[PDB]
Amino acid sequence: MVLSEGEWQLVLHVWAKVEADVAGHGQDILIRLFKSHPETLEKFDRFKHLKTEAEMKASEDLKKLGVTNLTALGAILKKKGHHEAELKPLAQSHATKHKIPIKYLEFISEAIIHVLHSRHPGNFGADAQGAMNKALELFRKDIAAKYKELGYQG
Numbered sequence: 001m002v003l004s005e006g007e008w009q010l011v012l013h014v015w016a017k018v019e020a021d022v023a024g025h026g027q028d029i030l031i032r033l034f035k036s037h038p039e040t041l042e043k044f045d046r047f048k049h050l051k052t053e054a055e056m057k058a059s060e061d062l063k064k065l066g067v068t069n070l071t072a073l074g075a076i077l078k079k080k081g082h083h084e085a086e087l088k089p090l091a092q093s094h095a096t097k098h099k100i101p102i103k104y105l106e107f108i109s110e111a112i113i114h115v116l117h118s119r120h121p122g123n124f125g126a127d128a129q130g131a132m133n134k135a136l137e138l139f140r141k142d143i144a145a146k147y148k149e150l151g152y153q154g
């Protein structure tokens, strides 16, 4: 699988809006993830205690993680497929320390698409969503390959 430049531009076009307030998008995405698939929250030893969306929105640390997460993803998307260097540290920590299965990466991918669909209809129509899905499928495919090399293959 390989995205076209046109598809990458649709991806970067909506990400540009995300960057107007990465912290806000991060909260929305993590909260959507945790509510749609509660089991995923259990992987966060530092945030597993949060009981409600209100507590999640009020968590300064969760907001910080959201920023760290989306900024790392943004750097990967901007590489337009040439993200080998960026994927190494991410795959190692998520495979060996956090133990995040591909199934959960699919869940957060679903969350990202849901939030962009809701917040950015102006830059997330059908074709743009297709481009983002293709970019995230590539991300997950390469991460999975790395997982396997690392001995996890979650």
Ligand code: HEM
Binding pocket: 040, 041, 043, 044, 045, 046, 065, 068, 069, 070, 072, 073, 089, 090, 093, 094, 098, 100, 104, 105, 108
């Ligand atoms: C878009 C996909 C994701 C990206 C780009 C991403 C990125 C990051 C980054 C940059 C960090 C900090 C550095 C590191 O430890 O590697 C991090 C930490 C972490 N990530 Fe991910 N992550 C993603 C998905 C997930 C998912 C789906 C889960 C589990 C449901 C997860 C769980 C964690 C945990 C538990 C930490 C540690 C948080 C803490 O500081 O307590 N990540 N992630």
